[PDB]
Symmetry: C2
């Protein structure tokens, strides 16, 4: 490409909405897994 | 034009060749007119 070329993405807004949906659900699964992990490690130490 | 575009000139080499000729000849015309300034100031002054 000579110098800098402008390029345009297809459906960027819809892709952002689904990205937010996947990230937020993925982050919740991190909290749920962490909560269960600490629950077991609370009992194991106790 | 978005960002910087590349453009290509038509016959750049032939145009440079003819540019030197016109510049060089006009330099000769300057010297000739200076000579007429000297042969006319020697006669008068
Ligand atoms: C969970 C769903 C979260 C959606 C977040 C959307 C953020 C993107 C955004 O700014 O959306 C503006 C309006 O959104 C919309 O109109 C779409 C909102 C989501 C629709 C309902 C989902 C359920 C478009 O405006 P922008 O130009 O800033 O878009 C940026 C994209 N590149």
């Amino acid at each position: 490409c000579p110098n800098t070329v402008d390029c345009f993405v297809s459906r960027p807004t819809e892709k952002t909405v689904f990205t937010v949906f996947m990230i937020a659900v993925s982050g919740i699964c991190i909290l749920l897994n962490v909560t269960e992990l600490c629950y077991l490690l609370i009992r194991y130490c106790s």
